[PDB]
From a paper:
Ene-reductases (ERs) from the family of the Old Yellow Enzyme (OYE; E.C. 1.6.99.1) are nicotinamide-dependent flavoproteins catalyzing the asymmetric hydrogenation of a wide panel of activated alkenes (e.g., α,β-unsaturated ketones, aldehydes, nitroalkenes, carboxylic acids, and derivatives). We selected a new thermophilic ene-reductase homologue in Chloroflexus aggregans, a peculiar filamentous bacterium. Produced in high yields in recombinant form, it proved to be a robust biocatalyst showing high thermostability, good solvent tolerance and a wide range of pH optimum.
The overall structure of CaOYE shows the typical α8/β8 TIM barrel fold described till now, for all OYEs reported. The enzyme accommodates one molecule of FMN cofactor on the top of the β-barrel core, at the C-terminus side, buried within the active site cavity (for further details). In agreement with the general behavior of Class III OYEs, crystal contacts support a dimeric architecture, despite native gel analysis and size exclusion chromatography suggesting the protein behaves as a monomer in solution (respectively). The interaction surface between monomers in the functional dimer covers 1451 Å2. The two monomers interact via at least 8 salt bridges. As already reported for the other described Class III OYEs, the C-terminus of each monomer stretches through an “Arg finger” (in our case Arg352) reaching the active site of the adjacent monomer, interacting with the respective flavin cofactor and vice versa. In the complex with malonate, one carboxylate oxygen of the compound forms a hydrogen bond with the side chains of His177 but not with His180. The other carboxylate moiety of malonate is involved in a network of hydrogen bonding interactions with Tyr28, Cys25 and Arg352 of the adjacent monomer that explores the active site, suggesting a role for all these residues in substrate bonding and positioning.
Residue numbers in the entry:
A (entry chain A), B (entry chain C): 1 to 354
The structure:
Amino acid sequence: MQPHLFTPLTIGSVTLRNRIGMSPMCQYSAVDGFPTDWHLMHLGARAAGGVGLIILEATAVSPEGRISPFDLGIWSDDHIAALSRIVKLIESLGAVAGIQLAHAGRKASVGRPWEGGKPIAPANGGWPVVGPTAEPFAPGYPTPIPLDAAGIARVVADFATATKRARAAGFRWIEIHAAHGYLLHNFLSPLGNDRNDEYGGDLRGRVRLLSEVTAAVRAEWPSDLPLAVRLSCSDWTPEGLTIADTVEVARMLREQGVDLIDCSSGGIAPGITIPVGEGYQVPFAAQVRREANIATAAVGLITRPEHADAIVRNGDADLVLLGRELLRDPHWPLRAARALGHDLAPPPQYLRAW
Amino acid sequence: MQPHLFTPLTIGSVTLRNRIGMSPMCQYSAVDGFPTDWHLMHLGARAAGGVGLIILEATAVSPEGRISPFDLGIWSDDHIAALSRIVKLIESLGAVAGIQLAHAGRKASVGRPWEGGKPIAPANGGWPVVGPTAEPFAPGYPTPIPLDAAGIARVVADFATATKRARAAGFRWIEIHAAHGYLLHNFLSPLGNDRNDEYGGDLRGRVRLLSEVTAAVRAEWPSDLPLAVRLSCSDWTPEGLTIADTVEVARMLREQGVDLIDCSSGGIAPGITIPVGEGYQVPFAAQVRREANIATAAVGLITRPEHADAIVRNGDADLVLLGRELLRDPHWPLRAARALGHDLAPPPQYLRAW
Ligand SMILES: Cc1cc2nc3c(=O)[nH]c(=O)nc-3n(C[C@H](O)[C@H](O)[C@H](O)COP(=O)(O)O)c2cc1C
Ligand SMILES: Cc1cc2nc3c(=O)[nH]c(=O)nc-3n(C[C@H](O)[C@H](O)[C@H](O)COP(=O)(O)O)c2cc1C
């Protein structure tokens, strides 16, 4: 009589068949924000693998908000068609389709990870980036234009429009990317802010932008459908965001009608030694969930089925997200099920294999 | 000097990157012979997973030749567009796109395996079947209208047009399905085929259909592209086909220009006890390679990386085809490379996971 890895989960009118999600993972394979056949196959395989929730990569609410020129985008109505096609593949295979709205902020305009991931200058078809202050992310990175009032309203509107498009594309779950040194986290974290205005200083100020985005997003997204935020729970130095801070943000987000905190960390700056290891971020998921009375997703080097189960049974999170493990093994849910002794049918096309 | 599982294979203008092929596997997921997003993801995924050669399922050269109403088709020019799209995805991931042309013949007009695979009547969307004699396959199956002068050269033409179509879609490997109880095998096997024409009785006779089909295909198939034929090598019964016969058939197909025999078995009639087990068809692949001096593929309950490798190292076969292993694990070649100590990188999108 406790929740396990293969217990459904209901928020609003959306029921995940189990507690396994595919974590948002950029593919750097879009053209002008448009997906290719790559995306259909990549996301499809996991939905056929048996995960209950596919969350699409960081999808840029605007061109300047992309990590790379190859980022999936949602800044035009033209983006709706190919995304809904992806939604239909995913849902025919019994998973729920979700999407991560993103803005890379001062970390935008870089090359693909597998090409060294170096900043691309505006001469080579980069673009000027934005942020809370003109403080570059690292040596060699561009000097961001600090957002003023007009730039801030633009972002909120951009998230708001993106939300409409996601709805039209048939997504039944949306996550706001407010982690990994990107625009929202950059505002939230003391390490990147020097802003003395209402969008910095105190925690109440530093959270203002995430809060305006959340409200704009939430207002466009039917109360009926799950909304998530992904946070960088800790900056992993004493002078940055701590879990305590995160808890207070989660509490405020809950009040704004967010259904789930997806609990990540890192990214605000380079050179921060982060204690990586199996389930190293689960404790953040545990704390947020207890203390902010909100559902959480746990993530980071979760690869073993019994570990995933323990996370759900121990009430440390509601959702277990797999990144790399699902890249290695899109059929992991099916193996998880047999390892734990739960019932999961493969695609009918594959019955004669199992 | 001599090869292992990850050694390239050249035939004409086509270089397979390793010795691992995906065995043709019917998906029962087409409408009027057209594929869906199911196929693109299903086939793309195994190419993403690093197999050298993707053989598409049994693709019907005519409507009547389909196993099920839901079979892939290549009887119409309409079918070119969608299949080339499948080919471009496959080729973009570094694998070679192949296709198996098929005619279910007497076993034609049945439902999906997971829907009881029971015959479907003409009143109910079924179609009258065709083949060597008027004898049904088993209790319950329709009555095959025997093929005449006319019927025969329609089948031969069909295989030939299909072949033109496959070239147009960009397939660079073609296999003729002359196994599993289907039209060509049905004519080749004494069991259940009592024909007494020049298309029956003697081996010289029983093989005529396959040889003409072979000739037709070869003529349309450019000479720099490999051609394979899958055979049932044994009927597993005393009075049926034997490795001795298959060896003779192979020797004949080598002289017709066929580049490889894909060595399967079974399917002529029900009630034949088949001694299934790991590598149970591999001695057939060995013997055909030994005595007919022709390249071969092995297939049948091969799952282990070292066994697949041992098959190639020993010269039992040139190519190892995996069916069910790849349904279960599209990424098998990546795991098999790691276990045997060969370099095989995953798609760049996935490098962070390996
Ligand atoms: C290729 C790749 C792409 C990623 N893309 C995103 C992304 O678009 N958005 C995001 O919030 N996190 C992204 N991440 C981080 C993961 O979503 C996830 O939080 C973390 O890697 C979980 O660890 P795991 O990969 O060990 O499961 C990505 C990670 C990888 C390896
Ligand atoms: C779902 C499924 C569909 C298949 N469809 C075909 C087919 O279209 N053509 C064919 O020649 N063999 C077909 N086969 C047989 C396999 O290609 C293969 O030769 C045999 O299963 C080899 O053993 P393996 O699956 O253990 O590798 C199919 C097998 C399965 C399980």
